[PDB]
Structure 1
């Protein structure tokens, strides 16, 4: 084979649960965690503008 991008060679035995890529997410737990965080900060926002304001 020939390398064209380092995404599987760079830090292969060092990166653990992190990724060496120009793409912020590649696995669905990353995607669903940010989805849950968006839901939770949206819930916090609407709690404030209904109960503090």
Structure 2
């Protein structure tokens, strides 16, 4: 049967059907912390280069 297909689906739904501790809560907080920080630093960096070009 299409187990590999239902595999991604089970993992896509895992958050509500087979998730560990708050996997996406802890990952969404980490991603935002790392994405927000890198986006903020890249913005402050690109902004500084504008005045230091």
Output the TM-score relative to the length of structure 1: 0.44
Higher percent of residues as helix:
2
Give the Cα separation in 2 of the matches to 1:33 and 1:52: 27
Give the Cα separation in 2 of the matches to 1:49 and 1:30: 28
Q: Could you list the runs of 5+ residues in structure 2 that have no partner in the other structure? A: none
Using the TM superposition, name which of 31-40 and 2-11 deviates more. 2-11
Query: Structure 1: which 4+ aligned runs deviate by more than 3 Å?
Result: 1-26
After superposition, the Cα gap between the structure-2 partners of 1:5 and 1:29, relative to the gap in structure 1 and judged at 3 Å, is farther
Using the TM superposition, name which of 16-25 and 39-48 deviates more. 16-25
Count of matched residue positions in the alignment of Structure 1 and Structure 2: 53
Q: CA RMSD in A?
A: 8.0
Give the Cα separation in 2 of the matches to 1:33 and 1:17: 26
Asked which structure has the greater RCO (Cα within 8 Å, sep 6+), the reply is 1
